[PDB]
Design a protein around this nucleic acid. Structure first.
Ligand SMILES: [Mg+2]
Ligand SMILES: [Zn+2]
Lengths: 100, 227, 167, 229, 50, 36, 73, 151, 149, 136, 220
RNA sequence: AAUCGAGCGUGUGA
């Protein structure tokens, strides 16, 4: 939603004629890449943590036991980007040409 | 049927032409595993006809890819059928639904490395229930021609062979419908002079049962008592 | 060995001016950069082997008293053999300039028409081989796989050495 | 030192579903015995199943019977799942004859004193013509496991081509086995438990006989280890 | 009936394989409950409601 | 029993030395019999 | 050290020499008819030859000496 | 006719007779490797899970050619050079090729993880055998942080 | 909606159920995803694809056993396979798979006699495909031949 | 295809001095990796030009380059196959150790085929204003 | 048919060492190998008779964590060493033993006096090592009879986990077995190691007859 | 000895 708000604001600026086509295209790609990175950051960390009640009754956070996290962090099968695609967001995609 | 489907199985099933469909709405007059006779209703009759729709069904007919095309009726006596309703399901069809495979109980877990790298572990119950057993029909042709020494004869006179191979033969050398034949067994008997056996045989490594025998004879040929 | 105008740089002028080791380092480093950008790890030794195979020829600039003509392109091994012969005679060796041939060209420019023909351009290689009356000694791997004899490598190397020593 | 298990309850909620209680068992022996018995049951319970069929006027299963709603292949598949209990013999030949409109069910096989049909409502096929007469000979053997028709062959390997409608035999009478180990309110000890075996079968086998046969098999197998040379 | 590797799901990214499996379990459960009601010879009204 | 491969051009005398007979007719085989 | 030779490398020296000795020993046991002393526990002949090589009692020089002695008589 | 003599002879022949398995395309040297074959009742070849990286082979329907070295010298050089046991490193960079993946890596990762409040936490053990007993008997969990005497 | 359908059937909404090993009976530590999936049998059967030959049929222009499954053919031990055998240094294996496994008129018969006599012999041989090459170069207008030594 | 390790030791003294590729702040490979298995053409000297670390005739192994790291060696010259003074092949020491055995390369190993395969195979994995110091 | 069964032709044991033996039988029925292996493993792991150390007394301990000097190894290490002691009790169910040896030097297990009912399995099991002239230790050890394993998480001064079962190392593996025609059979190989209280194969035999006695209610 | 064979197009897997 924050990414949508910022792209709407940059579209409003473009409607006001502040930036150009190529510069706006690059800036929007950059901010969407930043949103992708933030989503991956808020995903992988939420996927590697647990709240475990210890012998004292207090919480000792540890590495998560999630099966897909085991697959990724273990390196058995899968990478960080694949987990981002199936659990976060797919991200930017390419046109038939090189352009994103 | 697929327990989980998309709803497009009906369109594929009825638009492929492999299922016997009801041309005119009526009432079933007779259902057999090979024939369906429909007494057409009077609301959709046209003057000058009896009002009977007859649907013969393809039964174990070989397809292009050596599969089985078979039609099973999906209606019983007295059932009122309407225009466009499925009367017999073709292969991979269940009550007008496209049925490519079988619904199976699966568990997503490694099992002593027997599903390593997309491998599949299968319960013995699947084999027992014959869930994925398939029928494969092949066609073998025997053509009688004229040789440079003389014409070739269809007969049971094959020399230097055992008595067991001569037990399944008849007066002409063609073994009967439904016989269990394996690779190396003679289907259509024929010998060439030199004599040498020029008969058709089952390909080695293939063992099946004969379901159809078709004979094409050009004019002027003496057909034997088997023929 | 110093660049006058900036821009993309050719390998052949690098060889003719900067030297041999300079072009070998250039090729090895650039190939390994391409491989590592994809996260692939290969040794530099293999690229050095191929670069050596790319540098088996020499151009006779001034033959002098040597048996070589002027302007020809001859195998560098023959040039070293002639230099050894002249050193045994005590005479100075003929000067030579190395050439950086392409991979296809170096394969085609081999001293064996059998391998060049079995690789590409069979009609050409055969035409020059027949015009020149070429002779192909059985010494490469292809020349022995095609005739069905043991390759000069691995467990077959000893057999080839025995053949050389017996004749 | 060990409290031996004993049959304390055999509850027959239905003809194909029975709960058998074993009590008492010490800690650990419950799961051990439950797994051993479940595997021996699922693996080596003998039974009777349809093996060969010979319908008159039929040469092979890849054909149609006159005035019959289902294919001969479908008929053989329906006869595969026929629950028959045979007493005293390991090889019986039933005959089924029928004619006229109606569903030919399992209640129409010619009655014999040595054969019992557990489910008479089992629909074998249907007839759709009044003159359509169906007559079949069904050979039932007593076996164990699953013997596919492709593997088993005739003794002399030469049998009637017109007959020999071979049906795959699923000799196993049991279809589902669960077992639970539960705490028993024993007034003598507190470490004792009870083993509840919940069995779902085809109705052709007595649960007590099946469990005793499994125990006999297990003991005979362990006898090789006990009697070691 | 079939044992599948969960490792082929994340790398190959075919996740419809999991949702379809869950839906198959749900459908077969509803079918087995209808089967339980039919074995009991329950009244037609019960089947209608369920 | 060989150590190399020699390639060159062939004399018309060499080509004639290779052959055992001169080919005249353009027909391959008769179709009434199987005789070439 | 039978399928993959590590221990017999320090017992036969050069592995090309090992290949040559293995070929000669196989052809001898096939044609020379020498009676071995190792009992046959359903083992391949090449396996027994590798065992005798990793024993280290037979090498190339001794084989050459025995060949010369045999060609003398 | 598949007699008992045939079975005995097949048993004789298969043992210690290397067989070269080969998946196309043969991209590098390891695309063909020798194996010791074992008789399977089925009609498909059983492939070792570790050599799947050398062949670039996954069991999603890949086919694999099978070649039989015939003479003694080819058998010897299959045993000495071609065998997958004698080819552990990659000629491209010297790195090992038999590095496990998928199921093995996940299993080892699971069996070496730590849990903060696992069953059996704090216990002091006499060695690996006691850990084996405590796991198999269901007394101590696999992720329990303990203190063990290691040799 | 799938969770609700699981609830109506009295099933765990997580789609995972305590599963038990059939060999030991021990419950798996974590819940296992169990369900129903639509499996398809493909027109790729080992009854078809499995094939293996030994001393079958040969072509006529070359003596290489050509063909495939339908024609009882051999396996194309192509160029890259020869490269792989070269990189191993396995020279005798190349000699087998170029002269013995194909392209051999007389050496493929006494080798079979040796095998049925319990011998491995007669590896050297001259490929008849190379003879075909020589004949189609000579008949093209070029003199190519072998030397005495 | 025709290139085979045909000799044992040519005794050449020319070779390539090698530095680690640096693009910015990072180092692509340590000196160890690119010298691992190589053969030096000279005596490697400890900084201060006083002591000889390793002789020129030894096979640079993991232990030797670990010692070099301990001594913080800067640049090494090794016998490459390009500067090999052998006719009709390459000697063993100009090609360094066999990356699949661990010992010295035997005579008669076709490294050209090995090189070609080792380069081609990864091909299937292939696609298709100011400078600042960031370290102390 | 449904009554007769094939007889094991090849029953072989390889004696790697005294307590290390490889026992296997050819052939077993399909699924029988895993059933027998799991049952035997469970009964060996938790239903085998033996004796072990359960309680020990160290005087002067009244707080949570206390220390005692003059001993080379920590009290935790000493009790852990005492845990693995192989003790046989033939007459009674509970006997209290005392260790009595001092002096600077090696400390074996054969210096404790022989008992009529208690016999020590191995005389070389070190307990500790004294190093001081004024350091001498003599504690009491409670030996209880039992079966299996009991952690001391819940329920004299110190409580020691008891390894009642004489089983040191039990593992079973099932391989594919082959005959003239059938190739889907099971072959069970058992790897057994013991602490010396009972022979390796003898413990398996004892548990096999224990399990065969548990099913005497169904003997025909 | 009986024993036997190719090209082109097309669609498929790896
Ligand atoms: Mg692929
Ligand atoms: Zn050199």
């Amino acid at each position: 939603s924050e990414a949508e708000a910022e792209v709407a604001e940059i579209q409003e600026q473009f409607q006001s004629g502040l930036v150009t086509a190529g510069e706006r295209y690059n800036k929007v790609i950059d901010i969407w890449a930043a949103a992708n990175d933030r989503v991956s950051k808020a995903m992988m960390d939420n996927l590697q943590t647990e709240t475990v009640i210890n012998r004292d009754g207090q919480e000792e956070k540890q590495v998560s036991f999630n099966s897909i996290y085991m697959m990724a962090d273990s390196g058995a099968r899968g990478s960080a980007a694949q987990i981002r695609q199936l659990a976060g967001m797919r991200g930017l995609m390419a046109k038939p040409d090189g352009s994103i | 049927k697929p327990l989980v489907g998309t709803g497009m199985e009906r369109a594929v099933a009825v638009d492929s032409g492999v299922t016997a469909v009801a041309k005119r709405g009526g009432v079933v007059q007779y259902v057999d595993a090979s024939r369906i006779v429909i007494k057409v209703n009077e609301d959709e009759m046209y003057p000058g006809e009896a009002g009977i729709d007859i649907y013969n069904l393809t039964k174990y007919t070989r397809s292009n890819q050596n599969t089985c095309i078979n039609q099973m009726p999906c209606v019983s006596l007295g059932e009122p059928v309407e225009r466009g309703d499925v009367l017999a399901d073709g292969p991979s069809t269940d009550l007008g639904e496209l049925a490519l495979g079988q619904n199976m109980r699966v568990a997503f877990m490694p099992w002593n490395g027997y599903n390593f790298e997309d491998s599949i572990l299968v319960s013995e119950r699947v084999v027992q229930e014959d869930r994925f057993t398939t029928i494969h029909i092949q066609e073998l042709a025997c053509v009688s021609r004229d040789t440079k020494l003389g014409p070739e004869e269809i007969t049971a006179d094959i020399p230097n062979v055992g008595e067991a191979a001569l037990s399944k033969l008849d007066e002409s050398g063609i073994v009967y419908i439904g016989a269990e034949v394996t690779g190396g067994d003679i289907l259509v008997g024929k010998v060439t002079p030199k004599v040498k056996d020029s008969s058709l045989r089952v390909p080695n490594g293939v063992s099946g049962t004969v379901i159809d025998v078709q004979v094409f004879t050009r004019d002027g040929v003496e057909k034997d008592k088997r023929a | 060995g110093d660049v006058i105008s900036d821009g993309p740089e050719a390998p052949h002028d690098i060889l003719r001016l900067r030297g041999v080791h300079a072009v070998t380092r250039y090729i090895v480093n650039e190939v390994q950069d391409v491989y590592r950008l994809q996260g692939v790890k290969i040794n530099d030794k293999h690229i050095e082997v191929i670069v050596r195979q790319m540098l088996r020829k020499a151009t006779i600039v001034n033959a002098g008293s040597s048996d070589f003509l002027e302007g020809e392109q001859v195998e560098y091994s023959r040039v070293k053999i002639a230099n050894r012969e002249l050193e045994a005679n005590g005479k100075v060796g003929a000067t030579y300039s190395r050439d950086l041939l392409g991979i296809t060209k170096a394969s085609l420019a081999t001293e064996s028409f059998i391998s060049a023909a079995s690789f590409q351009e069979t009609t050409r290689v055969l035409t020059e081989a027949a015009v020149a009356g070429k002779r192909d000694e059985l010494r490469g791997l292809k020349e022995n796989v095609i005739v069905g004899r043991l390759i000069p490598a691995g467990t077959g190397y000893a057999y080839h050495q025995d053949r050389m020593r017996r004749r | 030192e060990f409290l031996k298990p004993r049959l304390v309850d055999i509850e027959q909620v239905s003809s194909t579903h029975a709960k058998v209680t074993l009590e008492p068992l010490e800690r650990g022996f419950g799961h051990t015995l439950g797994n051993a018995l479940r595997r021996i049951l699922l693996s080596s319970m003998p039974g009777c199943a349809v093996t060969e069929v010979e319908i008159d006027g039929v040469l092979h299963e890849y054909s149609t019977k006159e005035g019959v709603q289902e294919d001969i292949l479908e008929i053989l598949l329906n006869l595969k799942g026929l629950a028959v209990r045979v007493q005293g013999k390991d090889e019986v030949i039933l005959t089924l004859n029928k004619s006229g409109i109606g569903p030919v069910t399992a209640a129409d096989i010619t009655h014999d004193g040595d054969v019992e049909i557990v489910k008479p409502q089992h629909v074998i096929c249907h007839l759709t013509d009044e003159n359509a007469s169906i007559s079949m000979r069904i050979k039932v053997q007593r076996g164990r496991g699953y013997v596919p028709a492709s593997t088993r062959i005739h003794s002399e390997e030469d049998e009637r081509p017109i007959g020999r409608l071979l049906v795959d035999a699923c000799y196993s009478p049991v279809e589902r086995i669960a077992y639970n180990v539960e705490a028993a309110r024993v007034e003598q000890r507190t470490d004792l438990d009870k083993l509840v075996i919940e069995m779902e079968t085809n109705g052709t086998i007595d649960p007590e006989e099946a469990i005793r046969r499994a125990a006999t098999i297990l003991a005979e197998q362990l006898e090789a280890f006990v009697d070691l040379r | 009936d079939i044992v599948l590797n969960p490792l082929g799901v994340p790398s190959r990214m075919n996740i419809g394989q999991i949702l379809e499996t869950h839906l198959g379990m749900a459908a077969k459960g509803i079918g087995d409950k209808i089967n339980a009601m039919l074995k009991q010879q329950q009244e037609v009204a019960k089947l209608r409601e369920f | 029993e060989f150590d190399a491969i020699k390639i060159a051009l062939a004399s018309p005398d060499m080509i004639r030395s290779w052959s055992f007979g001169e080919v005249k007719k353009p027909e391959t085989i008769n179709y009434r019999t199987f005789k070439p | 050290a039978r399928v993959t030779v590590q221990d017999a490398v320090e017992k036969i020296g050069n592995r090309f020499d090992l290949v040559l000795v293995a070929a000669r020993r196989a052809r001898q046991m096939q044609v020379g008819g020498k009676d071995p002393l190792v009992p046959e526990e359903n083992d391949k002949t090449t396996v027994i030859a590798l065992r005798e090589i990793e024993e280290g009692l037979i090498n190339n020089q001794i084989l050459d000496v025995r060949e010369r002695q045999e060609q003398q008589e | 006719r598949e007699e008992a003599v045939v079975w005995d002879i097949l048993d004789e022949v298969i043992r210690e007779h290397p067989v070269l398995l080969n998946r196309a395309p043969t991209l590098h040297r390891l695309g063909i490797q020798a194996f010791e074959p074992v008789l399977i009742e089925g009609k498909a070849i059983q492939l070792h899970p570790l050599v799947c990286a050398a062949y670039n082979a996954d069991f999603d329907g890949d086919q694999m050619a099978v070649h039989v070295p015939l003479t003694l010298e080819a058998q010897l050089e299959a045993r000495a050079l071609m065998m997958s046991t004698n080819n552990i490193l990659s000629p491209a960079n010297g790195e090992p090729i038999i590095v496990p993946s998928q199921d093995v890596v996940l299993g080892l990762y699971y069996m070496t993880r730590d849990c903060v409040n696992a069953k059996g936490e704090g216990m002091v053990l006499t060695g690996p055998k006691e850990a084996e007993r405590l796991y198999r008997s269901g007394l101590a969990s696999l992720h329990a942080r303990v203190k063990v005497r290691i040799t | 909606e799938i969770k609700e359908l699981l609830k109506l059937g009295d099933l765990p909404t997580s789609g995972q159920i305590r599963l038990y090993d059939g060999r030991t009976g021990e419950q798996f530590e974590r819940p296992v995803t169990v369900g129903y999936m639509y499996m398809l049998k493909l027109n790729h059967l080992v009854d078809d694809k499995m094939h293996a030959r030994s001393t079958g049929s040969y072509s006529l222009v070359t003596q290489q056993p050509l063909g495939g499954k339908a024609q009882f053919g051999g396996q194309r031990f192509g160029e890259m396979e020869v490269w792989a055998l070269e990189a191993y240094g396995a020279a005798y294996t190349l000699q087998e798979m170029l002269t013995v496994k194909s392209d051999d008129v007389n050496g493929r018969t006494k080798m079979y006699k040796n095998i049925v006599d319990g011998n491995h012999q007669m590896e050297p041989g001259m490929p008849e495909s190379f003879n075909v090459l020589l004949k189609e170069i000579r008949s093209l207008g070029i003199n190519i031949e072998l030397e005495d030594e | 295809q025709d290139l085979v390790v045909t000799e044992d030791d040519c005794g050449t003294h020319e070779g390539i001095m090698m530095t680690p590729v640096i693009e910015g702040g990072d180092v692509k490979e340590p000196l160890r990796d690119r010298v691992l298995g190589r053969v030096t053409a000279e005596d490697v000297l400890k900084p201060g030009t006083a002591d000889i670390l390793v002789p020129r005739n030894t096979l640079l192994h993991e232990q030797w380059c670990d010692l070099l790291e301990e001594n913080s060696v800067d640049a090494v010259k090794v016998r490459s196959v390009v500067s090999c003074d052998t006719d009709f092949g390459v000697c063993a020491h100009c090609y360094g150790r066999d990356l699949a055995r661990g010992h010295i390369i035997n005579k008669g190993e076709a490294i050209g085929v090995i090189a070609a395969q080792s380069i081609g195979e990864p091909g299937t994995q292939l696609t298709m204003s100011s400078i600042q110091v960031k370290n102390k």
